[PDB]
Amino acid sequence: GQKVHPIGIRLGVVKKHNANWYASPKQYSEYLINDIQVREYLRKKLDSAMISNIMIERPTGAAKITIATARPGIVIGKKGEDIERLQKELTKMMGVPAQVNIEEITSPDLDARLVADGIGSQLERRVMFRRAMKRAVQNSMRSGAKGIKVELSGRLGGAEIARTEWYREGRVPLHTLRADIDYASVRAETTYGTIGVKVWIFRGE
RNA sequence: UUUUUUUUUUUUUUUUUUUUUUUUUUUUUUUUUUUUUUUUUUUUUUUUUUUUUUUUUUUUUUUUUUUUUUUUACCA
RNA sequence: UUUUUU
RNA sequence: AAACUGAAGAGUUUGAUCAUGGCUCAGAUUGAACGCU
RNA sequence: GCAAGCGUUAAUCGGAAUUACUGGGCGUAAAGGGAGCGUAGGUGGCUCGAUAAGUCAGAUGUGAAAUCCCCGGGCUUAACCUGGGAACUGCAUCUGAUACUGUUGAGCUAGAGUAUGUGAGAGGAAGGUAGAAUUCCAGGUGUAGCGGUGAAAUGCGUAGAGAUCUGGAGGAAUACCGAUGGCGAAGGCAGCCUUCUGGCAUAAUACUGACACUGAGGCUCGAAAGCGUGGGUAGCAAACAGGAUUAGAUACCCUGGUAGUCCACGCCGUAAACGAUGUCUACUAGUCGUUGGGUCCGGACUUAGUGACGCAGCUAACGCAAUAAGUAGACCGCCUGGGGAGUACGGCCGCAAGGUUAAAACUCAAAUGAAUUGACGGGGGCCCGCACAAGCGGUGGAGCAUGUUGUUUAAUUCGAUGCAACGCGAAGAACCUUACCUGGUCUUGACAUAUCUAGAAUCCUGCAGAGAUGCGGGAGUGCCUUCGGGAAUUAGAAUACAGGUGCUGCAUGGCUGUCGUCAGCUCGUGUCGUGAGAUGUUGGGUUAAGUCCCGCAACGAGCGCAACCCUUGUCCUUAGUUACCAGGGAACUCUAAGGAUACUGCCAGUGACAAACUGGAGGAAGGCGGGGACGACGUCAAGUCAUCAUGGCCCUUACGACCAGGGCUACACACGUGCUACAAUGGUAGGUACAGAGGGCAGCUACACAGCGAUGUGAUGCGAAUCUCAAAAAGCCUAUCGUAGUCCGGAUUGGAGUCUGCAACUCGACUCCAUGAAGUAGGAAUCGCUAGUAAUCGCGGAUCAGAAUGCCGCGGUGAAU
User: Fold this and answer.
1) Quaternary form (predicted)?
2) Nucleotides in E strand less than 7 A from protein CB
3) Sequence-distant (≥ 6) Cβ neighbours of residue A82 within 8 angstroms
4) Is the N or C terminus of chain A more exposed, i.e. has fewer CB atoms within 10 Å?
5) Are A112 and A75 a contacting pair, CB within 8 Å?
6) Is the distance from CB of A67 to CB of A103 less than 8 angstroms?
7) Distance CA A87, CA A20 (A)
8) Cβ A116 to strand E below 7 Å
9) How many CA atoms lie within 13 A of A191 on its CB side?
């Protein structure tokens, strides 16, 4: 526990906030609470389709939610009937129409959250942690990442003593502020406890 | 028995001349030390064996007892 | 000159 | 014609190593005993 | 896995090459006898013969049968029985062979010895002698110290020391030479001279003719200490005495000091007696020293020693390496896990001390060698950081605030505990928070889904009660679809369950501290090593930096460093309101976006023809311009299950849930952080200046009036570059106080109020009047700070109804070193 968040330290130099609205000092708190509610609802509902970058920007009441997923087809549904239900469920627990327009991740091996959640799903499927970690490294490296680091922390393989393991390939220079490093941290709820999964994908400058 | 020596702080020792209680070691609190020693700062601490007696005042002067040491306890 | 221990 | 056919190692000293070196084990055997059957 | 058996125990061999004949070792792991001489023994040169014992071959006799093995035969198969073979590695007697061993005859010279000439040497034994120096004694001069130590003190000295000079006595050792130099079997042996005496080295000739090597027992010699008798006795010095040091100091240091050390003659018989390496022989790259000879032309060669390197070979490695630990041979000694133990007992030796030979029980699964990586050292070298030093100001003493301990309580909720817990979680406990205590209560429950019964929810009410709660009365009849009805909704009908700040941070995730913003930490390939590993990453510089350059069996890479980010320092451009004011202006400040500049870029030197450093110019800025964020691999089973999430454990009319009151605020006490002071560089009373940043509808308030004041009423502007908080204080001028516990300090207490809030008793903050406590500069000890810093002065904000001396920021003045 001695490292800054890669996204947060880069929030203004090369990255952008995944929430772009403006409020007044009194309105801001309720905007933020509603935003966090929508985010947690979305991440629990669309847990099948591999969404990674839900972005909330609300211009004057009406909002424009933008989810980026690697599998837009399943979350949109047939002719677009799941997306309408999602639209109205968002609108119900926000103020007025939440236009959710859905992007597409054309390289799911370069997004850190998709890699981390894949490793997590494999871990909850009682797959060897070393093999899952190495598979993710290989997949990202041959998909074209300039660097990938993946850290697995916890009771790995049912071990009584938790340990931290990791693999790195490429550069992933955390201290460089202009590095374009995607980062994700998820948890796999195994049968022996929680295993934390951290993924750094360094893509350029 | 006897004659001398005395008995005081936790201990072992100083007083004292009627007008007061002492070092040292402790002990307690601090401080140095990772922590304990050592060390350094502070403190606390005496029915002066007891009991009559004299004095305005006694641990100190008298008398008794009581512990302590000694030294004696011999002749048939 | 004088630093014992765990 | 034949009597000419036979040879395995492991554990344990160290943070690790190689050596030394003891201890221990896997085999065969019995005029056997004991326990369960 | 075995199976009518399967396991255990006992016992033997195996594995164990762990007694090694096959088939081990002894430099450092256990192991070379202290060294020699030599007895028994073992082994042993060349040539020509003899013999035929060993040896080899053949034949014969025998080596019982059974068993083992081979080929078969009979039991239904098999076990079993059985025929014939093979074998029985042996012994005996004859015959043959003669390479080797034995026994012999003759011969030989190469191993080993002899005679003769030269040479070196601390080889040994006995005498004598010399010169320095110490000590002692006796004198002359001389006067107050000497001596000793890290300091001292003991000690010596005015009865005259020490110093200096002159005589005398005596003992021991032999500076310089002096040297991995010499000699000796080892132990050992140093002045010089004589005597007695051993070995060695060397050139040639002659001679003997295997006379040799090794060697159990045995004998001899054998450092130092020690023992006996008799002498000696200067210095040194066990013991011993005193002085110091120390917690102690039977020591180390100091001052003395006896045995002993010296001699003679004897004992002892042991040493890390070491090269931790038995002796002897042969052979096997080389290079450079040195000692004693010799031969040739200052060198060359050859010998016997004595050293340093270094192949092959050897070794576990270190290392050895013609002076082997290599390649072989002869003989001897020794080892067989660590302790017990080189001990006991018994012999033998000894005057004794003791030596020598040498077990066992028992006990433990190790004990060891060499090397590797770290860590550490009261090891070495180089370097950095407010680490010290140089300074400035504090803390530790007072009162108060706050946190913790302890104590006390019904409870004083829980966690944080060396740095890196203690104004920490908590960015703000009257109720709430709240997790604790007392009491009053509820049980699918305050909260989610499954469900079916009525109703739009929702609003207004009465009483009882501290409240949670309990019992009752009125208004409303939703909306879309419409007679199935639906997003919400109130009271349960029950099972699932919910709920748990209950436990385990030593089951965990996430998050954080810390070494430490220290400069490190690794990897791939290559190479080296049996290997753990190494190299890279080390070295010469250089840097803030594993920064950079150059070397280099390394070549490269990664995370760290730096840079990219924010802020500040100068300028330019766009823009000019609510900002600004030089002459409505578009100058300026400012505001807030985008850029410019700074790069060792230029100059001079130093530097390996480098990296780099030193100084200079220009510039607002000069070398990293200043400040921040950014915290490598990892370490502390570091902190957090009470933010959260979570594995497991635990409670489900209760450890869950609701309400009122109380507690978290108690104080013999102790500590940690602070604030206010102890005053004159100041207090007080008047004037008069100069900020920044931040907040404001969950509000800030112009102004007026009332009040001593906190505040209260009316009212105005402002979601703010507009209005406001708001006046900055320290500062400057004048007066006064005149060193006093005061005109310092402002705790504590009494009284009266204002606000916030349902509510100020426990337990709020301010205001006013009165009181006026300790405190006069703080022990041992200890902390922060290197420049706009410390010190000091005010001003904002988060949390927040109210409640900062804490936290987070802002500017003012502004050092010392």
Assistant:
1) Part of the 30S ribosomal subunit. Forms a tight complex with proteins S10 and S14.
2) 487, 507-517, 557-566, 629-635, 637-639, 645-647, 696-698
3) A75, A76
4) N
5) no
6) yes
7) 19
8) no
9) 6
